Amino acid sequence: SEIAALKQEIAALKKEIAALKAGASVQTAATSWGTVPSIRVYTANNGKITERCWDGKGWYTGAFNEPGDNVSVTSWLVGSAIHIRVYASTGTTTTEWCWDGNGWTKGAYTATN
Amino acid sequence: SEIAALKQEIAALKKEIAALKAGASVQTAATSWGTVPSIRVYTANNGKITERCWDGKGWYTGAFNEPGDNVSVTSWLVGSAIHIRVYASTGTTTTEWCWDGNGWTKGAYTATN
Amino acid sequence: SEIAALKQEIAALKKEIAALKAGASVQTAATSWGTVPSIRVYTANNGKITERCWDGKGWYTGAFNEPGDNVSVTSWLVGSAIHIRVYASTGTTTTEWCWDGNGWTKGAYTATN
Numbered sequence: 001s002e003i004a005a006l007k008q009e010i011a012a013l014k015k016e017i018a019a020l021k022a023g024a025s026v027q028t029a030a031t032s033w034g035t036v037p038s039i040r041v042y043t044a045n046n047g048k049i050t051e052r053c054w055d056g057k058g059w060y061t062g063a064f065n066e067p068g069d070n071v072s073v074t075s076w077l078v079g080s081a082i083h084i085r086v087y088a089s090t091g092t093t094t095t096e097w098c099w100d101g102n103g104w105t106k107g108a109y110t111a112t113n
Numbered sequence: 114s115e116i117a118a119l120k121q122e123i124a125a126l127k128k129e130i131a132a133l134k135a136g137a138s139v140q141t142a143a144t145s146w147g148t149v150p151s152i153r154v155y156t157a158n159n160g161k162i163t164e165r166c167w168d169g170k171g172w173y174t175g176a177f178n179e180p181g182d183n184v185s186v187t188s189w190l191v192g193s194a195i196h197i198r199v200y201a202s203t204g205t206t207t208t209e210w211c212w213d214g215n216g217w218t219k220g221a222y223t224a225t226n
Numbered sequence: 227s228e229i230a231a232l233k234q235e236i237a238a239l240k241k242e243i244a245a246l247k248a249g250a251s252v253q254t255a256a257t258s259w260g261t262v263p264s265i266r267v268y269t270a271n272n273g274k275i276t277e278r279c280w281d282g283k284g285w286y287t288g289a290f291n292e293p294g295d296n297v298s299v300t301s302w303l304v305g306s307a308i309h310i311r312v313y314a315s316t317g318t319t320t321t322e323w324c325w326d327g328n329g330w331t332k333g334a335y336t337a338t339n
């Protein structure tokens with residue numbers, strides 16, 4: 001019956017991986033500012049984070065393009081200038097990315113002192 | 114020893130799926146507004162997103178009830194009117210949902226132009 | 227050929243778990259306040275959530291240290307006092323944690339009434 005147990009094991013093994021990846025989806029983060037408002041939506045997909053932008057008219061693709069399997073975001077206004085920080089994580093490594101009005105740059109964030 | 118390798122493989126196979134789903138949990142997103150404040154907490158559970166609300170007294174169930182395995186949220190005030198956008202993702206499909214004071218509606222967001 | 231199918235099954239079984247955990251990473255949430263600003267970044271890692279803080283000078287470790295596999299956060303100001311709510315989830319159990327200026331405390335949030 002060992003071969004029959006293998007047939008059952010193969011079926012259980014195909015079910016266990018089908019179910020894993022079936023329930024798998026992309027992960028997003030969002031932030032907004034002003035009264036219009038502007039909206040930025042960051043999507044982690046297959047180890048890549050990309051950005052979509054809304055400034056009142058329609059949606060378009062933003063500059064942000066960095067690696068990661070997970071993303072979070074916060075932002076604040078200095079008067080009307082927007083400042084954005086995006087936290088991108090692969091494995092156990094979190095990288096901070098900074099928008100301060102003139103391009104994305106790597107930030108000072110570290111996970112442990 | 115092939116049958117013995119199968120016994121070991123079955124044990125490794127039961128460990129590999131137990132560990133996967135054991136570490137699995139629901140995913141949440143949160144937003145807030147005002148000085149009271151009001152709080153909204155969105156929970157993705159088994160392909161369903163639902164909403165819990167706090168307006169200063171206690172917690173209750175909100176109107177939001179849409180499919181998705183992942184959720185993010187942002188909100189803004191126009192004077193004292195709250196506007197909410199919720200980003201719900203299943204597989205590779207992200208759907209935007211809009212609260213503007215008179216019911217949830219599907220938003221214009223798309224992932225690629 | 228059953229033993230040969232087992233050799234193939236073992237290879238498929240080692241690929242299916244390698245790929246799972248390979249794509250696995252930590253999950254983060256972020257919030258900010260003021261014009262400096264202050265930033266708080268919460269990281270869920272191996273069932274533990276910890277906190278990193280920025281108040282204008284550099285990054286340091288905060289007080290927050292609670293269990294969970296997933297985290298979300300929101301915050302608001304009452305004048306200049308910061309109030310924070312962190313939502314920590316293990317399995318299907320979401321616990322709210324409250325910062326109101328004098329230590330973290332468990333909040334009134336429940337998932338269903």
Ligand SMILES: OC[C@H]1O[C@@H](O)[C@@H](O)[C@@H](O)[C@@H]1O
Nearest residue numbers: 040051053062063064082099
């Ligand atoms: O004008 C669009 C730009 O807006 C900024 O807020 C950032 O989100 C940039 O990544 C983006 O390219």
Ligand SMILES: OC[C@H]1O[C@@H](O)[C@@H](O)[C@@H](O)[C@@H]1O
Nearest residue numbers: 085096098106107108109280
């Ligand atoms: O502008 C650069 C700096 O901005 C601060 O607000 C923090 O986000 C730092 O980690 C970052 O390096």
Ligand SMILES: OC[C@H]1O[C@@H](O)[C@@H](O)[C@@H](O)[C@@H]1O
Nearest residue numbers: 153164166175176177195212
């Ligand atoms: O009054 C409760 C209502 O508040 C709005 O902000 C939305 O979150 C609705 O989904 C909810 O039903």
Ligand SMILES: OC[C@H]1O[C@@H](O)[C@@H](O)[C@@H](O)[C@@H]1O
Nearest residue numbers: 054198209211219220221222
């Ligand atoms: O109110 C409808 C519209 O509101 C805007 O702010 C964006 O979120 C759009 O994608 C949406 O369709």
Ligand SMILES: OC[C@H]1O[C@@H](O)[C@@H](O)[C@@H](O)[C@@H]1O
Nearest residue numbers: 266277279288289290308325
């Ligand atoms: O001063 C640092 C403190 O700041 C508060 O906002 C909280 O984030 C605490 O957990 C933290 O220890």
Ligand SMILES: OC[C@H]1O[C@@H](O)[C@@H](O)[C@@H](O)[C@@H]1O
Nearest residue numbers: 167311322324332333334335
């Ligand atoms: O300060 C305690 C209370 O604060 C409120 O804003 C909510 O977050 C409650 O769930 C919490 O118990």
